[PDB]
Write a protein that binds this ligand. Structure first.
Ligand SMILES: Cc1cn([C@H]2C[C@H](O)[C@@H](COP(=O)(O)OP(=O)(O)O)O2)c(=O)[nH]c1=O
Ligand SMILES: Cc1cn([C@H]2C[C@H](O)[C@@H](COP(=O)(O)OP(=O)(O)O)O2)c(=O)[nH]c1=O
Ligand SMILES: Cc1cn([C@H]2C[C@H](O)[C@@H](COP(=O)(O)OP(=O)(O)O)O2)c(=O)[nH]c1=O
Ligand SMILES: Cc1cn([C@H]2C[C@H](O)[C@@H](COP(=O)(O)OP(=O)(O)O)O2)c(=O)[nH]c1=O
Ligand code: NA
Ligand code: NA
Ligand code: NA
Ligand code: NA
Ligand code: NA
Lengths: 398, 397
């Protein structure tokens, strides 16, 4: 049978990849979003993927004319008109637990509002915005540390899983739907946040303010700013200044302390670039000092280089171990899919120091992984003619 | 002992009244809010009550020096310096379930936000706004139909009872405090709502839109408006218009139906004026046809006249009975505390017809009540020398 996948980012890519794997009998057509540049960024380009995999890319107007297909929307950017199809097998993943948080910026609004939870919802496309009947959902816990970016990445992951768990019933017409309730229904348009003019509001509680920081913390788009200085999270003090809300109590190199309606807050200056530079050659002890919010250790620059990737490229094995102890992914990837192991290989090759591989492997380092060109570390070693190092690396795999 | 009552409205008045009744020996001092107009309105004037009962009004600066008082803020308008008193018996009633909804407009924001409940909270005055340790608090249901005014009245009533239930522990220092949690706190300033520029936003869900209506419904202040027409509540329909949200789908003498993000909503035009006028003489069958939202029957005009009060003064007994069956208060009062019974008394004097009295008494009419000059219907009848009716009403007692 046939499926049209309409949308973007790792959710479209990964739903597609699964289909090519487990449903090879299925003709796939793609619709891409107007702003998919064709180049991989912090999310994969769906357009790139479809080109690289000979998946035909069509228009929505063309998709309307395909019979005996289902249609599946995944962060799609176009209004879909149900009457224009010759069927009603029209499905969307929305990044909320409907009926709450219809519309936009669902990575921010639940955080701003102090929600503990959100979700992803599979539903029918009807004539309105995220109004159609619910087929499946999955609740997501928002952790107190988590940013809008963390929550978006959870949406992407949980949304992928929910499709995968339901896509057979979508293909079989063996699914059940239920109309959305009136009660609790909520919606935010794009007018509700003006990302070109964000401003922290300190006439609020400390809880609210920290939730502002979190909601606006999505590095590839922006960081919250106080007085032009970029902030990466904050914490609540027990202190309660009688200075009017917004008054800056202290300023140092690492932080700004501000008066609120209730408890003082400390806003950490974003020092990610500096942290990343230190990852080349410093140890544990130095990095632990630079750090304020722990999750800053999992951020990435514009190439997708994290702390643990930089450490790997420079053979900083003591730091790699500490980072992984803190939550870092031993198999982290840049935006081309290049893995920690590949970067470590570069170090081994340069230094002639092979000795640290065993320890990384015991931390979970995976030599089988492929980048987005379908190459393993061994592909690169074969190409560069480094057969002895290739054999050496294979000898430690388990 | 002594207490300084700082604040306004029926909560200030009714806590004071209770203390004069039940704690004879407590000396009371008052601080009034600056905007207290000295005239009884939808809330009683605390300054008027203090003058009329010889409760001395003091300044804040004076209050700081009375070392042996406790201090109770009841919608007080001035920020205090806690450390400046030589005691720490400083208490406040806040109209939310703290630490949620610190600050202003707490009869609006919970409704707007889609909350099922709010609360009232008795707590210490400390550094922060509304940040002091909690002594006692109670949750309050917000019914799906209730307006900001309904919620406000509830905060006044539940706040008063919360103070009454705890006031002995406050004067005797036998209360327990628990510091407020950081988590879940929320706060809204005066700037969060411009009441001089309310606008309904139709780029929202039906649930959200009906909540806006409710939240902005507070007649003595304003009603929400569409196309300059005032609206008194609404409902959600089952249809889902394809038109862009905010599009007017239907318009008539009763109501306006509008498209939203999800379900269409009907906004009911405010016909309170019309209803109140017909309460003079029309019967329940006619008045029933006018009603778009049931709670309109408990609204009041600028003098505090409700449908039941107007019906009583015009001797409309058949209407009174139906109104009461719909949940009207048989002892409703205007803003001067004049009761239904006193209005019915006027009608009995003008008409010479006492035939309705027994039935209203059977429905709960209370002849013992006192207006805000502290007179009963009997006092009035004596003064007027209306000896016949006096005799008859007294026969019920
Ligand atoms: C547009 C924009 C979005 N965001 C946040 C809020 C969104 O929920 C989240 C993802 O938005 P977006 O990347 O537009 O993803 P989608 O198109 O799949 O919604 O990013 C920002 O932090 N800054 C921005 O400028
Ligand atoms: C991680 C890292 C890489 N590099 C080098 C290694 C690569 O040769 C080069 C290109 O970056 P990159 O975007 O990682 O491309 P690829 O996925 O092809 O590696 O940058 C540094 O110079 N410093 C670093 O910290
Ligand atoms: C000032 C104002 C308040 N309100 C509502 C929201 C407030 O929670 C409610 C009570 O406000 P107010 O009468 O100022 O009482 P308090 O000072 O005890 O809060 O009235 C309006 O609807 N319109 C208005 O213009
Ligand atoms: C209830 C009602 C009262 N009245 C009269 C009788 C009232 O005593 C008079 C003044 O009303 P009001 O100003 O409300 O003061 P009071 O406390 O004395 O009632 O108006 C009407 O004319 N029409 C009415 O519908
Ligand atoms: Na069709
Ligand atoms: Na916007
Ligand atoms: Na402060
Ligand atoms: Na205001
Ligand atoms: Na609509």
């Amino acid at each position: 049978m046939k499926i049209i996948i309409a949308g973007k980012n790792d959710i479209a890519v990964n739903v597609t990849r699964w289909l090519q794997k487990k449903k090879k009998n299925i003709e796939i057509y793609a619709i891409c979003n107007a702003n998919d540049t064709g180049i991989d960024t912090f999310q994969r380009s769906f357009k790139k993927y479809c080109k690289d995999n000979l998946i035909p890319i069509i228009s929505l107007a063309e998709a309307y004319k395909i019979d005996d297909a289902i249609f599946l929307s995944l962060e799609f950017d176009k209004i879909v008109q149900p009457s224009k199809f010759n069927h009603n097998e029209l499905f969307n993943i929305h990044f909320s637990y409907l009926p709450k948080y219809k519309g936009m910026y669902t990575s921010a609004w639940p955080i701003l509002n102090g929600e503990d939870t959100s979700g992803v919802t599979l539903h029918k496309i009807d004539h309105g915005i995220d109004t159609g009947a619910i087929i499946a959902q999955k609740e997501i816990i928002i952790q107190p540390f988590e940013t809008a970016k963390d929550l978006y990445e959870k949406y992407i992951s949980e949304g992928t899983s929910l499709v995968i768990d339901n896509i057979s019933t979508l293909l079989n017409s063996e699914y059940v739907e239920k109309e959305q309730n009136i009660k609790y229904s909520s919606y935010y348009s794009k007018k509700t946040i003006d990302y070109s003019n964000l401003e922290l509001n300190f006439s609020k509680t400390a809880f609210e303010i920290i939730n502002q920081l979190r909601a606006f913390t999505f590095r590839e788009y922006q960081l919250p700013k106080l007085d032009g200085v970029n902030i990466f999270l904050g914490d609540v003090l027990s202190s309660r200044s009688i200075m009017k809300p917004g008054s800056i109590l202290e300023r140092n190199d690492k932080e700004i302390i501000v008066s609120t309606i209730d408890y003082d807050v400390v806003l950490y200056k974003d020092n990610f670039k500096e942290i990343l530079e230190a990852c080349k050659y410093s140890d544990s002890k130095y990095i632990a000092k630079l750090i304020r919010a722990k999750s800053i250790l999992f951020e990435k620059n514009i190439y997708g280089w994290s702390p643990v990737i930089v450490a790997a490229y420079h053979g900083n094995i003591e730091l790699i171990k500490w980072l992984v102890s803190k939550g870092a992914n031993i198999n982290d990837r840049n935006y081309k899919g290049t893995t920690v192991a590949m970067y470590f290989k570069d170090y081994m090759l340069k230094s002639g120091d092979y000795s640290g591989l065993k320890m990384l492997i015991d931390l979970g380092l995976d030599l089988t992984l492929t980048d987005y060109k379908d190459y393993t570390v061994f592909d690169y070693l074969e190409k560069s003619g480094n057969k002895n190092l290739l054999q050496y690396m294979m000898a430690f795999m388990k």
